[PDB]
């Protein structure tokens, strides 16, 4: 399911 | 849940589909350059733990802040664009960002 590192990217990434 | 970047992106990234999240920051940099911050300037986190790192340079960010008139389901956001140093808390192996601590 979603790791903490995956959640950070989903929430804050915008490459 | 109308138009503007924050309304669109908070919804698309599943931050406001089931609540209106008060604040969220989007970083307009390649993900690997954000992950590179975990080996940059080590600083204390607000909570006194020391697994936080501050970026050597500023990065392009968009701050999304809920307006005082936003109520679920119609979340509304104020969009502010800024170039700031980011502070991230890092964990794991690979040692990677898991929380934002600030922007300075």
Curated annotation (Swiss-Prot), chain A:
**Annotated positions binding substrate:** 7, 10
Which residues are responsible for catalysis?
A: 12 (proton acceptor)
Cellular compartment(s): Secreted
- The coiled-coil regions, if any, are none
Annotated glycosylation sites = 1, 7
Q: Which domain of life is it from?
A: Eukaryota
Annotated phenotype, changing residue 12 to A: Loss of activity
Q: In which tissues is it expressed?
A: Pancreas.
Quaternary form? Interacts with and forms tight 1:1 complexes with RNH1. Dimerization of two such complexes may occur. Interaction with RNH1 inhibits this protein. Monomer.
| Its biological purpose | Endonuclease that catalyzes the cleavage of RNA on the 3' side of pyrimidine nucleotides. Acts on single-stranded and double-stranded RNA.
Similarity annotation: Belongs to the pancreatic ribonuclease family.
Q: What is this protein called?
A: Ribonuclease pancreatic
Q: Which gene encodes it?
A: RNASE1
What is the covered span of the full protein? 27 to 41 of 150
């Amino acid at each position: 399911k979603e790791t903490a590192a995956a959640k950070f990217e989903r929430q804050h990434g915008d490459s | 849940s109308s138009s503007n970047y924050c309304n669109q992106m908070m919804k698309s990234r599943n931050l406001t589909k089931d609540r209106c999240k008060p604040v969220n920051t989007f970083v307009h940099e390649s993900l690997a350059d954000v992950q590179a911050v975990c080996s940059q300037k080590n600083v204390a986190c607000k909570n006194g733990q020391t697994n936080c790192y501050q970026s050597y340079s500023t990065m392009s960010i968009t701050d999304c802040r809920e307006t005082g008139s936003s109520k679920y389901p119609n979340c509304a956001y104020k969009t502010t664009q800024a170039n700031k140093h980011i502070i991230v808390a890092c964990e794991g192996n690979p040692y990677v960002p898991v929380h934002f601590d600030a922007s300075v």
